């Protein structure tokens, strides 16, 4: 009849069970794999920086001179 | 191992990380451009402007 939350608070157990339905945890003991995630994010940032740079340059060069006036210069 | 060592080298400092991000973006864009240009030239053989049999015979 003891509340579940009260029993969980008053009984700190070493064996902790997570959901694990869509995220399979690493076995207890293996080191955290944070370098791999950071490098995946780094590749994504490579991609995002490329897109931002090309968009900015596209807008600037569109506002720049055009082929018609460039050719009329001779 | 390799990932951890590279993480140390290019992420000990955030400024170094940003510099590496910019350099990697530049290099990856260049490599992608090179690969796509090679694919385009391999696919479109004999149709390029330089491939026209007559160019100064007019």
């Amino acid at each position: 009849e003891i509340p579940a939350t009260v029993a969980a608070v008053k009984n700190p157990s070493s064996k902790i069970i997570y959901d694990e339905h869509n995220h399979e945890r690493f076995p207890p003991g293996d080191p955290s794999k944070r370098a791999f995630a950071y490098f995946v994010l780094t590749g994504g940032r490579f991609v995002y920086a490329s897109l931002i740079r090309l968009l900015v340059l596209k807008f600037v060069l569109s506002m720049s001179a055009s082929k018609d006036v460039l050719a009329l210069a001779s | 191992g390799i990932f951890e060592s590279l993480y140390k080298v290019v992420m000990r400092r955030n400024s170094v990380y940003v510099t590496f991000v910019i350099a990697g973006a530049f290099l990856g864009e260049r490599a992608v451009d090179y690969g796509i240009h090679k694919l385009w030239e391999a696919n479109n053989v004999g149709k390029r402007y330089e491939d026209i049999p007559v160019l100064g015979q007019k």
């Binding site: 740079r53 900015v56 | 400092r13 400024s15 170094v16 940003v18 510099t19 910019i22």
Partner: peptide, 24 residues
């Protein structure tokens, strides 16, 4: 920090050379 400021200046210069790309 002097070193931090220098590294951030290097990063900003690299970003500027990536954007403008003077003589690649």
């Amino acid at each position: 920090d002097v070193k931090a400021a220098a590294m951030w200046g290097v990063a900003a210069a690299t970003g500027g050379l990536y954007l403008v790309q003077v003589s690649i």
